Design a protein around this ligand. Structure first.
Ligand SMILES: C[As](C)(=O)[O-]
Ligand SMILES: C[As](C)(=O)[O-]
Ligand SMILES: [Zn+2]
Ligand SMILES: [Zn+2]
Ligand SMILES: [Zn+2]
Ligand SMILES: [Zn+2]
Ligand SMILES: [Zn+2]
Lengths: 105, 105, 105, 105
Protein backbone atom coordinates (compact mmCIF):
# COMPACT_ATOMS: atom_id res chain seq x y z
CA UNK A 1 0.00 0.00 0.00
CA UNK A 2 3.11 2.16 -0.07
CA UNK A 3 3.82 4.52 -2.93
CA UNK A 4 7.28 4.00 -4.43
CA UNK A 5 9.28 7.19 -4.85
CA UNK A 6 12.30 7.94 -7.03
CA UNK A 7 14.72 10.87 -7.46
CA UNK A 8 12.60 11.62 -10.53
CA UNK A 9 9.09 11.66 -9.01
CA UNK A 10 9.97 12.84 -5.51
CA UNK A 11 9.12 16.53 -5.76
CA UNK A 12 5.77 15.76 -7.34
CA UNK A 13 4.89 13.35 -4.53
CA UNK A 14 5.44 15.83 -1.71
CA UNK A 15 3.50 18.67 -3.33
CA UNK A 16 0.34 16.63 -2.78
CA UNK A 17 -2.66 17.49 -0.61
CA UNK A 18 -1.94 14.83 2.01
CA UNK A 19 1.12 14.72 4.27
CA UNK A 20 3.69 12.18 3.07
CA UNK A 21 5.69 9.80 5.26
CA UNK A 22 8.89 8.77 3.45
CA UNK A 23 10.77 5.63 4.39
CA UNK A 24 14.42 5.89 3.37
CA UNK A 25 15.54 2.22 3.25
CA UNK A 26 17.94 -0.25 1.62
CA UNK A 27 18.06 -4.00 1.06
CA UNK A 28 21.13 -4.28 3.26
CA UNK A 29 19.23 -2.79 6.17
CA UNK A 30 18.02 -5.66 8.34
CA UNK A 31 15.72 -3.52 10.55
CA UNK A 32 14.08 -2.07 7.43
CA UNK A 33 12.81 -5.53 6.46
CA UNK A 34 11.24 -6.16 9.85
CA UNK A 35 9.70 -2.72 9.60
CA UNK A 36 8.14 -3.04 6.14
CA UNK A 37 5.09 -5.04 7.29
CA UNK A 38 4.46 -2.62 10.15
CA UNK A 39 4.67 0.36 7.77
CA UNK A 40 2.47 -1.32 5.14
CA UNK A 41 -0.25 -1.92 7.72
CA UNK A 42 0.19 1.59 9.06
CA UNK A 43 -0.31 2.85 5.52
CA UNK A 44 -3.47 0.80 5.04
CA UNK A 45 -5.08 2.16 8.22
CA UNK A 46 -4.35 5.85 7.59
CA UNK A 47 -4.33 6.36 3.83
CA UNK A 48 -7.12 8.86 4.53
CA UNK A 49 -4.73 11.07 6.53
CA UNK A 50 -1.23 10.38 5.22
CA UNK A 51 0.51 8.80 2.24
CA UNK A 52 3.30 6.42 3.17
CA UNK A 53 6.07 6.23 0.57
CA UNK A 54 9.36 4.40 0.30
CA UNK A 55 12.61 5.55 -1.27
CA UNK A 56 15.39 3.04 -2.08
CA UNK A 57 18.60 4.89 -1.08
CA UNK A 58 20.72 2.45 -3.11
CA UNK A 59 19.01 3.75 -6.29
CA UNK A 60 18.24 7.36 -5.41
CA UNK A 61 21.38 9.11 -4.15
CA UNK A 62 20.10 12.64 -4.98
CA UNK A 63 17.08 12.75 -2.70
CA UNK A 64 18.90 10.90 0.03
CA UNK A 65 21.80 13.36 -0.03
CA UNK A 66 19.44 16.37 -0.26
CA UNK A 67 17.79 15.54 3.06
CA UNK A 68 21.04 14.70 4.77
CA UNK A 69 20.32 11.06 5.60
CA UNK A 70 22.92 9.65 8.02
CA UNK A 71 21.45 6.30 9.10
CA UNK A 72 19.07 3.74 7.61
CA UNK A 73 16.01 3.48 8.43
CA UNK A 74 15.02 7.18 8.52
CA UNK A 75 11.48 8.34 7.94
CA UNK A 76 10.66 11.93 7.20
CA UNK A 77 7.15 13.33 7.44
CA UNK A 78 6.45 15.98 4.83
CA UNK A 79 3.68 18.53 5.24
CA UNK A 80 3.15 21.36 2.77
CA UNK A 81 6.07 19.98 0.80
CA UNK A 82 8.56 20.45 3.63
CA UNK A 83 10.17 18.03 6.12
CA UNK A 84 8.56 18.58 9.54
CA UNK A 85 9.63 15.39 11.32
CA UNK A 86 12.50 12.97 11.06
CA UNK A 87 12.19 9.61 12.71
CA UNK A 88 15.47 7.85 13.23
CA UNK A 89 15.75 4.08 13.25
CA UNK A 90 13.20 1.33 13.72
CA UNK A 91 9.68 2.59 14.34
CA UNK A 92 7.23 0.28 16.18
CA UNK A 93 3.57 0.82 15.36
CA UNK A 94 3.06 2.55 18.73
CA UNK A 95 5.63 5.20 17.82
CA UNK A 96 4.26 5.81 14.31
CA UNK A 97 0.92 6.34 15.99
CA UNK A 98 2.35 8.71 18.63
CA UNK A 99 4.69 10.68 16.36
CA UNK A 100 2.12 11.32 13.63
CA UNK A 101 -0.70 11.93 16.11
CA UNK A 102 -0.98 15.49 14.76
CA UNK A 103 -1.33 14.61 11.06
CA UNK A 104 -3.72 11.89 12.23
CA UNK A 105 -6.11 14.23 14.01
CA UNK B 1 20.86 37.81 20.00
CA UNK B 2 19.34 34.43 20.90
CA UNK B 3 16.23 34.20 23.08
CA UNK B 4 16.16 31.38 25.65
CA UNK B 5 12.95 29.36 25.82
CA UNK B 6 11.68 26.93 28.47
CA UNK B 7 8.73 24.63 28.95
CA UNK B 8 7.04 27.44 30.90
CA UNK B 9 7.11 30.10 28.17
CA UNK B 10 7.44 27.98 25.04
CA UNK B 11 3.76 28.00 23.97
CA UNK B 12 3.50 31.75 24.27
CA UNK B 13 6.76 32.16 22.31
CA UNK B 14 5.62 30.21 19.27
CA UNK B 15 2.41 32.25 19.27
CA UNK B 16 4.29 35.51 18.80
CA UNK B 17 4.37 37.87 15.83
CA UNK B 18 7.32 36.52 13.85
CA UNK B 19 8.12 32.91 13.01
CA UNK B 20 10.48 31.48 15.62
CA UNK B 21 13.44 29.25 14.66
CA UNK B 22 14.05 27.08 17.71
CA UNK B 23 17.37 25.37 18.22
CA UNK B 24 16.90 22.37 20.57
CA UNK B 25 20.35 21.69 22.01
CA UNK B 26 22.15 19.78 24.71
CA UNK B 27 25.44 20.14 26.61
CA UNK B 28 26.68 16.91 25.04
CA UNK B 29 25.91 18.11 21.55
CA UNK B 30 28.61 17.65 18.94
CA UNK B 31 28.17 20.44 16.34
CA UNK B 32 26.23 22.93 18.51
CA UNK B 33 29.24 25.02 19.56
CA UNK B 34 30.31 25.00 15.90
CA UNK B 35 26.78 26.17 15.11
CA UNK B 36 26.38 28.98 17.66
CA UNK B 37 28.04 31.64 15.50
CA UNK B 38 26.11 30.52 12.40
CA UNK B 39 22.78 30.99 14.20
CA UNK B 40 23.85 34.38 15.59
CA UNK B 41 24.70 35.68 12.13
CA UNK B 42 21.54 34.16 10.71
CA UNK B 43 19.44 35.93 13.36
CA UNK B 44 21.28 39.18 12.71
CA UNK B 45 20.57 38.94 8.96
CA UNK B 46 16.92 38.00 9.37
CA UNK B 47 15.88 40.06 12.39
CA UNK B 48 12.73 41.29 10.62
CA UNK B 49 11.41 37.97 9.40
CA UNK B 50 12.36 35.62 12.22
CA UNK B 51 13.24 35.32 15.89
CA UNK B 52 16.01 32.77 16.65
CA UNK B 53 15.69 31.07 20.06
CA UNK B 54 17.20 28.20 21.98
CA UNK B 55 15.79 25.40 24.06
CA UNK B 56 18.07 23.25 26.18
CA UNK B 57 16.61 19.76 26.05
CA UNK B 58 18.56 18.79 29.19
CA UNK B 59 16.32 21.12 31.26
CA UNK B 60 13.06 21.23 29.27
CA UNK B 61 11.73 17.69 28.66
CA UNK B 62 8.04 18.55 28.11
CA UNK B 63 8.52 20.64 24.94
CA UNK B 64 11.29 18.33 23.79
CA UNK B 65 8.92 15.38 24.25
CA UNK B 66 5.90 17.07 22.63
CA UNK B 67 7.79 17.77 19.46
CA UNK B 68 9.21 14.25 19.19
CA UNK B 69 12.81 15.40 19.30
CA UNK B 70 15.44 12.66 19.00
CA UNK B 71 18.42 14.22 17.18
CA UNK B 72 20.60 16.96 18.69
CA UNK B 73 20.71 19.52 17.37
CA UNK B 74 17.26 19.88 15.84
CA UNK B 75 16.06 23.21 14.42
CA UNK B 76 12.30 23.71 14.05
CA UNK B 77 10.80 26.74 12.36
CA UNK B 78 7.48 27.62 13.93
CA UNK B 79 5.07 29.63 11.87
CA UNK B 80 1.34 29.47 12.47
CA UNK B 81 2.09 28.15 15.93
CA UNK B 82 3.17 24.85 14.44
CA UNK B 83 6.33 23.29 12.99
CA UNK B 84 6.55 24.17 9.30
CA UNK B 85 10.05 22.81 8.80
CA UNK B 86 12.66 20.89 10.76
CA UNK B 87 16.41 20.48 10.19
CA UNK B 88 18.69 18.12 12.09
CA UNK B 89 22.42 18.13 12.57
CA UNK B 90 24.95 20.80 11.71
CA UNK B 91 23.55 23.42 9.36
CA UNK B 92 26.13 25.78 7.84
CA UNK B 93 25.23 29.34 6.79
CA UNK B 94 24.44 28.61 3.13
CA UNK B 95 22.44 25.46 3.90
CA UNK B 96 20.43 27.28 6.54
CA UNK B 97 19.73 30.00 3.98
CA UNK B 98 18.75 27.53 1.20
CA UNK B 99 16.58 25.45 3.51
CA UNK B 100 14.70 28.36 5.04
CA UNK B 101 14.39 30.61 1.98
CA UNK B 102 10.93 29.15 1.35
CA UNK B 103 9.35 29.29 4.78
CA UNK B 104 10.29 32.87 5.54
CA UNK B 105 8.27 34.68 2.85
CA UNK C 1 18.96 -6.38 35.64
CA UNK C 2 20.31 -3.04 34.40
CA UNK C 3 23.10 -1.10 36.07
CA UNK C 4 23.06 2.70 36.05
CA UNK C 5 26.20 4.39 34.77
CA UNK C 6 27.42 7.98 35.24
CA UNK C 7 30.33 10.11 34.01
CA UNK C 8 31.96 9.15 37.33
CA UNK C 9 31.73 5.34 37.07
CA UNK C 10 31.53 4.82 33.32
CA UNK C 11 35.18 3.92 32.55
CA UNK C 12 35.33 1.33 35.31
CA UNK C 13 32.12 -0.27 34.07
CA UNK C 14 33.50 -0.89 30.57
CA UNK C 15 37.02 -1.94 31.59
CA UNK C 16 36.36 -5.65 31.40
CA UNK C 17 36.27 -8.73 29.20
CA UNK C 18 32.52 -9.19 29.62
CA UNK C 19 30.61 -7.18 26.97
CA UNK C 20 28.57 -4.19 28.22
CA UNK C 21 25.63 -2.76 26.25
CA UNK C 22 25.07 0.87 27.25
CA UNK C 23 21.71 2.45 26.50
CA UNK C 24 22.20 6.21 26.07
CA UNK C 25 18.77 7.64 26.90
CA UNK C 26 16.91 10.78 27.96
CA UNK C 27 13.83 11.75 29.96
CA UNK C 28 12.35 13.40 26.87
CA UNK C 29 12.68 10.32 24.73
CA UNK C 30 9.34 8.58 24.26
CA UNK C 31 10.79 5.57 22.35
CA UNK C 32 13.27 5.01 25.20
CA UNK C 33 10.41 4.52 27.63
CA UNK C 34 8.82 1.94 25.37
CA UNK C 35 12.15 0.11 25.11
CA UNK C 36 13.13 0.06 28.80
CA UNK C 37 11.01 -3.07 29.34
CA UNK C 38 12.41 -4.76 26.21
CA UNK C 39 15.93 -4.03 27.39
CA UNK C 40 15.09 -5.35 30.87
CA UNK C 41 13.84 -8.73 29.66
CA UNK C 42 16.89 -8.92 27.40
CA UNK C 43 19.33 -8.21 30.24
CA UNK C 44 17.74 -10.91 32.40
CA UNK C 45 17.83 -13.48 29.59
CA UNK C 46 21.46 -12.83 28.63
CA UNK C 47 23.13 -11.78 31.87
CA UNK C 48 25.65 -14.56 31.24
CA UNK C 49 26.80 -13.06 27.93
CA UNK C 50 26.38 -9.32 28.38
CA UNK C 51 25.99 -6.68 31.08
CA UNK C 52 23.23 -4.17 30.19
CA UNK C 53 23.57 -0.60 31.47
CA UNK C 54 21.89 2.77 31.12
CA UNK C 55 23.43 6.22 30.94
CA UNK C 56 21.17 9.27 31.22
CA UNK C 57 22.50 11.76 28.70
CA UNK C 58 20.87 14.77 30.36
CA UNK C 59 23.05 14.22 33.47
CA UNK C 60 26.16 12.77 31.87
CA UNK C 61 27.36 15.02 29.04
CA UNK C 62 31.01 13.90 29.28
CA UNK C 63 30.65 10.26 28.29
CA UNK C 64 27.87 11.17 25.91
CA UNK C 65 30.05 13.67 24.06
CA UNK C 66 33.03 11.29 24.17
CA UNK C 67 31.23 8.73 22.06
CA UNK C 68 29.69 11.24 19.68
CA UNK C 69 26.00 10.57 20.41
CA UNK C 70 23.84 12.39 17.83
CA UNK C 71 20.40 10.86 18.39
CA UNK C 72 18.40 9.31 21.20
CA UNK C 73 18.04 6.16 21.92
CA UNK C 74 21.60 5.04 20.94
CA UNK C 75 22.99 1.74 22.38
CA UNK C 76 26.69 1.02 22.22
CA UNK C 77 28.08 -2.43 22.75
CA UNK C 78 31.53 -2.35 24.43
CA UNK C 79 34.10 -5.16 24.20
CA UNK C 80 37.59 -4.92 25.65
CA UNK C 81 36.85 -1.34 26.67
CA UNK C 82 36.17 -0.17 23.12
CA UNK C 83 32.86 0.52 21.36
CA UNK C 84 32.36 -2.22 18.77
CA UNK C 85 28.73 -1.51 17.87
CA UNK C 86 26.43 1.54 17.89
CA UNK C 87 22.75 0.61 17.52
CA UNK C 88 20.77 3.67 16.44
CA UNK C 89 17.19 4.10 17.61
CA UNK C 90 14.54 1.82 19.08
CA UNK C 91 15.63 -1.83 19.23
CA UNK C 92 12.87 -4.51 19.20
CA UNK C 93 13.79 -7.75 21.02
CA UNK C 94 14.54 -9.46 17.69
CA UNK C 95 16.93 -6.70 16.54
CA UNK C 96 18.89 -6.93 19.78
CA UNK C 97 19.23 -10.70 19.26
CA UNK C 98 20.28 -10.31 15.63
CA UNK C 99 22.65 -7.37 16.16
CA UNK C 100 24.38 -8.85 19.22
CA UNK C 101 24.48 -12.35 17.70
CA UNK C 102 28.25 -12.52 18.07
CA UNK C 103 28.43 -11.83 21.81
CA UNK C 104 25.49 -14.17 22.50
CA UNK C 105 27.43 -17.46 22.58
CA UNK D 1 46.80 3.41 -0.06
CA UNK D 2 43.34 1.97 0.60
CA UNK D 3 41.99 -1.33 -0.76
CA UNK D 4 38.58 -1.67 -2.38
CA UNK D 5 36.78 -4.55 -0.68
CA UNK D 6 33.81 -6.44 -2.13
CA UNK D 7 31.51 -9.19 -0.89
CA UNK D 8 33.84 -11.47 -2.85
CA UNK D 9 37.17 -10.61 -1.24
CA UNK D 10 35.97 -9.24 2.11
CA UNK D 11 36.54 -12.26 4.36
CA UNK D 12 39.93 -12.87 2.72
CA UNK D 13 41.06 -9.37 3.76
CA UNK D 14 39.77 -9.14 7.32
CA UNK D 15 40.67 -12.71 8.24
CA UNK D 16 44.42 -12.48 7.98
CA UNK D 17 47.63 -11.02 9.27
CA UNK D 18 47.33 -7.43 10.29
CA UNK D 19 44.37 -5.31 11.34
CA UNK D 20 42.04 -3.99 8.69
CA UNK D 21 40.08 -0.71 8.89
CA UNK D 22 36.98 -0.75 6.65
CA UNK D 23 35.09 2.37 5.56
CA UNK D 24 31.46 1.48 4.75
CA UNK D 25 30.20 4.27 2.49
CA UNK D 26 27.52 5.26 -0.05
CA UNK D 27 27.21 7.70 -2.97
CA UNK D 28 24.69 9.77 -0.99
CA UNK D 29 26.86 9.98 2.11
CA UNK D 30 27.35 13.50 3.39
CA UNK D 31 30.83 13.56 5.00
CA UNK D 32 32.37 10.67 3.05
CA UNK D 33 33.85 12.72 0.24
CA UNK D 34 35.42 15.05 2.82
CA UNK D 35 36.79 12.06 4.72
CA UNK D 36 38.51 10.36 1.77
CA UNK D 37 41.86 12.24 1.94
CA UNK D 38 41.82 11.90 5.73
CA UNK D 39 41.49 8.12 5.61
CA UNK D 40 44.18 7.89 2.95
CA UNK D 41 46.73 9.87 4.99
CA UNK D 42 45.98 8.10 8.29
CA UNK D 43 46.42 4.81 6.40
CA UNK D 44 49.80 5.86 5.04
CA UNK D 45 51.06 7.06 8.42
CA UNK D 46 50.22 3.64 9.92
CA UNK D 47 50.73 1.33 6.97
CA UNK D 48 52.82 -1.19 8.96
CA UNK D 49 50.05 -1.52 11.52
CA UNK D 50 46.87 -1.49 9.54
CA UNK D 51 45.38 -1.96 6.11
CA UNK D 52 42.71 0.63 5.25
CA UNK D 53 39.90 -0.42 2.91
CA UNK D 54 36.60 0.89 1.53
CA UNK D 55 33.38 -0.99 0.99
CA UNK D 56 30.50 0.45 -1.01
CA UNK D 57 27.36 -0.79 0.76
CA UNK D 58 25.13 -0.54 -2.31
CA UNK D 59 27.42 -2.74 -4.44
CA UNK D 60 28.13 -5.14 -1.53
CA UNK D 61 24.85 -5.74 0.37
CA UNK D 62 25.96 -9.01 1.92
CA UNK D 63 28.90 -7.78 3.96
CA UNK D 64 26.94 -4.63 4.82
CA UNK D 65 24.03 -6.65 6.20
CA UNK D 66 26.30 -9.12 8.01
CA UNK D 67 27.86 -6.35 10.08
CA UNK D 68 24.59 -4.60 10.83
CA UNK D 69 25.56 -1.32 9.20
CA UNK D 70 23.06 1.48 9.90
CA UNK D 71 25.01 4.73 9.70
CA UNK D 72 26.98 5.96 6.75
CA UNK D 73 29.77 6.28 7.11
CA UNK D 74 30.72 3.50 9.50
CA UNK D 75 34.36 2.60 10.15
CA UNK D 76 35.06 -0.83 11.58
CA UNK D 77 38.53 -1.87 12.67
CA UNK D 78 39.08 -5.58 12.32
CA UNK D 79 41.75 -7.46 14.30
CA UNK D 80 42.31 -11.18 14.07
CA UNK D 81 39.08 -11.82 12.18
CA UNK D 82 36.59 -9.72 14.17
CA UNK D 83 35.61 -6.08 14.82
CA UNK D 84 37.54 -4.56 17.73
CA UNK D 85 36.25 -0.99 17.35
CA UNK D 86 33.68 0.98 15.43
CA UNK D 87 33.27 4.68 14.69
CA UNK D 88 30.28 6.30 13.01
CA UNK D 89 30.03 9.55 11.09
CA UNK D 90 32.62 12.07 9.91
CA UNK D 91 36.09 11.77 11.51
CA UNK D 92 38.95 14.26 10.95
CA UNK D 93 42.46 12.79 10.91
CA UNK D 94 43.23 13.68 14.52
CA UNK D 95 40.10 11.76 15.63
CA UNK D 96 41.10 8.69 13.65
CA UNK D 97 44.44 9.11 15.47
CA UNK D 98 42.89 9.55 18.93
CA UNK D 99 40.44 6.69 18.40
CA UNK D 100 42.46 4.06 16.58
CA UNK D 101 46.20 4.58 16.88
CA UNK D 102 46.50 3.05 20.34
CA UNK D 103 44.41 0.01 19.46
CA UNK D 104 46.78 -0.63 16.51
CA UNK D 105 49.95 -0.87 18.64
C1 LIG E 1 53.21 7.15 13.80
AS1 LIG E 1 52.61 8.90 14.01
C2 LIG E 1 53.52 10.00 12.80
O1 LIG E 1 50.83 8.97 13.70
O2 LIG E 1 52.93 9.48 15.70
C1 LIG F 1 50.56 8.52 17.99
AS1 LIG F 1 51.33 6.89 17.53
C2 LIG F 1 50.53 5.50 18.53
O1 LIG F 1 51.04 6.54 15.79
O2 LIG F 1 53.12 6.98 17.86
ZN1 LIG G 1 -3.46 3.21 13.40
ZN1 LIG H 1 18.36 34.84 4.07
ZN1 LIG I 1 19.23 -14.62 22.70
ZN1 LIG J 1 49.72 7.65 14.76
ZN1 LIG K 1 54.21 8.38 16.69
Amino acid sequence: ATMTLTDANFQQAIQGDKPVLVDFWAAWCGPCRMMAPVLEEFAEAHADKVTVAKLNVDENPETTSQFGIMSIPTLILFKGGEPVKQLIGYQPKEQLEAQLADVLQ
